Write a protein that binds this ligand. Structure first.
Ligand SMILES: *c1cc(-c2ncccn2)nc2c(C3CCC(F)(F)CC3)cnn12
Length: 298
């Protein structure tokens, strides 16, 4: 028993973390095969950050201007390409430790592991949940840009995130591996307003199912609320739209408690828990998906 935010093992991703330097700027990159992916703002100086003209900045850049390090091993950049807000450098050396990998794009509510890196050196890992605002609540200092988020799917590493910006205190965003930012955010040093965030309802439902299997069911009552009725209520109560899933169905079968029973429970919990905790919390713990809790339940 017990429910915690678990990170995926890091062994497959650690040998891909590199340092990328251009001018006075050093950030992190991801070395897969003979390609090095990194944020494109590595090529802009402090004077060119409010509204950088990246295409004009790329004219003054040569492959020799990049210093790519895998610890002390210097990689030779043959060529480079700008793909959205990301640079894809081609190096002479294939990473012999490149794992089986794919690129993916996470949706709000989905979780992944961030391998925090500084100066191309992994420091540790942490669990993040993509918010409805297309931001994550991570821990990143200047120099952690280029740290990657990933999820292990089977024996494959699915890379989903490359850290780029801090939109406000403890509020971070980055791009997918197509170079597209999550949300409408841009790599510009300007104040950027956040997309509307919501309590990830299906993640809180997962928390409630996990609580039932962790000797906590006081919130379960005879009232039921359909998905349709919950989704209308959710619009005006800061909760995201709910959709049933095969994992929710498995959780309903393991506990004998229907989704509708928990949707009615959420509406009651919205006006207060009355000092009672659900697994040590009086908050809408929406950081773990149904799949995350399912892996910690029996
Ligand atoms: C380092 C630190 C930061 C930062 N730290 C805290 C709050 C906000 N920002 N930002 C940056 C950048 C930044 C430059 C502008 C940009 F290109 F648009 C995005 C990245 C670079 N290095 N740091």
């Amino acid at each position: 028993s017990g429910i915690v935010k678990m990170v995926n093992p890091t062994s497959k991703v650690e040998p891909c973390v590199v340092s990328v330097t251009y001018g006075n700027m050093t950030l992190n990159g991801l070395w897969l095969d003979d390609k090095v992916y990194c944020p494109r703002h590595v090529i802009c100086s402090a004077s060119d950050m409010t509204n950088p003209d990246y295409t004009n900045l790329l004219c003054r850049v040569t492959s020799s201007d990049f210093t790519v390090l895998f610890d002390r091993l210097s990689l030779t950049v043959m060529s480079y390409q700008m793909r959205g807000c990301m640079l894809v450098l081609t190096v002479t050396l294939q990473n012999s430790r490149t794992p089986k990998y794919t690129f993916g794009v996470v949706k709000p509510g989905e979780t992944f592991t961030v391998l925090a890196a500084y100066n191309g050196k992994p420091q540790g890992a942490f669990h993040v949940t993509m918010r409805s605002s297309y931001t994550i609540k991570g821990s990143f200092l200047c120099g952690s840009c280029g740290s990657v988020g990933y999820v292990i799917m089977g024996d494959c590493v699915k890379f989903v995130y490359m850290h780029q910006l801090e939109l406000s205190t403890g509020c971070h965003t980055g791009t997918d591996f197509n170079g597209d930012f999550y949300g409408p955010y841009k790599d510009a040093q300007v104040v950027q307003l956040l997309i509307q965030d919501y309590i990830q309802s299906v993640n809180f439902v997962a928390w409630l199912y996990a609580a039932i299997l962790n000797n906590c069911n006081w919130f379960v009552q005879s009232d039921k609320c359909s998905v349709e009725d919950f989704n209308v209520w959710a619009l005006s109560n800061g909760f995201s739209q709910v959709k049933s899933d095969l994992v929710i169905d498995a959780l309903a079968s393991m506990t004998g408690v229907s989704l509708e029973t928990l949707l009615a429970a959420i509406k009651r919990l919205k006006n207060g828990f009355q000092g009672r905790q659900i697994m040590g919390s009086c908050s809408f713990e929406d950081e773990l998906t149904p799949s995350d809790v399912y892996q910690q339940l029996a």
